Structure 1
């Protein structure tokens, strides 16, 4: 499957793509404002994520640091990134269907649209100014708006027992972005697309 990753933000982002134990495609790249990066993701990929990283410094070897979404100091991510990260999540060719969503479970850094470029399903977006409106206790110094599990590490926020409810913090994310997951047991906002669809992820869609 083809994903085109487009940076419409006015600032540089460093896109990342991983399935947690391996890179997808090259795993990461710098995107200046307006640049597009096209990746190929193997059919059958389960548990893939794409995200943006901000305020990164990398040396010639591709080693460095980012203020949001750092994936162990690497330009080319093999593992998932450090919160806060708005996430585009997908599982492809799962019994004939692809499943896509946007999640705020690991916080929010950059607004995002995640849409098919082929026919037969809808896209999803979270484009509100979550960073500007972020509750004081969830604001990340480096930038972004952390989820409450990251900040407080309680069973209730992290849904450790598999039983948890919405919280004042989850409802903040949900009010601003209803079509994104706000906590682990949120009513699913997953979209079902035809198997082998192609997609575009746009940072700063609006």
Structure 2
């Protein structure tokens, strides 16, 4: 499946694409404002994610650091990134269907639209000013708004017992972005698309 990743933000982002134990395509690339990066993702890929990283410095070997979403210091990510990261998540060709969603369970750093470019399903967006409105205790110095599991490490925010409810913190994310997951047991906002759909992820869809 092809994903076109477009940076509509006024600032540079370093896109990342991983399935947690391997890079997807090249794994990451710098995108200046306006630039688009087309990747191919193998059919059947389960648990893929795409995210943006902000304020990164990389050396000639592709080693360095980013203030949000850093994936162990690498330009080309093999592993998932450090929160806070707005996530576009997908599992492809799962019993004839693709499944996509946007999640704030690892916090929020950049607004995003995740939409098919082929027919048969709708896209999802989280474009609110979550960092501007972020409760004081979740603000990340690096930039971004952390989720409460990352900050407080409790069984209730991390849903570690498989039973947990919404919280003051998850309801903040949900109020601003109803179509994104706000906690691990949120009512699912997953969209089902035809198997082998193609997609576009756009950072800063409104700006």
Fold match by TM threshold 0.5:
yes
Which blocks of at least 5 consecutive residues in structure 1 are unaligned?
A: none
- Structure-2 residue corresponding to 1:147: 147
CA distance in 2: counterparts of 1:185 and 1:122, whole angstroms: 23
Per the TM alignment, residue 168 of structure 1 is displaced from its structure 2 partner at its CA by 0.1
CA distance in 2: counterparts of 1:163 and 1:82, whole angstroms: 25
C-alpha deviations, 1:95-119, integer Å up to 9, x for none? 0000000000000000000000000
CA distance in 2: counterparts of 1:105 and 1:60, whole angstroms: 33
Per the TM alignment, residue 77 of structure 1 is displaced from its structure 2 partner at its CA by 0.0
Secondary structure at the residue paired with 2:144? coil
Per the TM alignment, residue 175 of structure 1 is displaced from its structure 2 partner at its CA by 0.1
Secondary structure at the residue paired with 1:193? strand
C-alpha deviations, 1:115-164, integer Å up to 9, x for none? 00000000000000000000000000000000000000000000000000
Q: CA RMSD in A?
A: 0.1
CA distance in 1: counterparts of 2:145 and 2:105, whole angstroms: 11
Secondary structure at the residue paired with 2:149? helix
Which blocks of at least 5 consecutive residues in structure 2 are unaligned?
A: none
CA distance in 1: counterparts of 2:45 and 2:56, whole angstroms: 27
CA distance in 2: counterparts of 1:60 and 1:100, whole angstroms: 35
CA distance in 2: counterparts of 1:3 and 1:72, whole angstroms: 24
Secondary structure at the residue paired with 1:84? coil
CA distance in 2: counterparts of 1:37 and 1:194, whole angstroms: 23
CA distance in 1: counterparts of 2:118 and 2:27, whole angstroms: 23
- Structure-2 residue corresponding to 1:163: 163
Per the TM alignment, residue 89 of structure 1 is displaced from its structure 2 partner at its CA by 0.0
CA distance in 1: counterparts of 2:194 and 2:148, whole angstroms: 34
CA distance in 1: counterparts of 2:105 and 2:185, whole angstroms: 10
Give 4+ residue runs of structure 1 displaced > 6 Å after superposition.
none
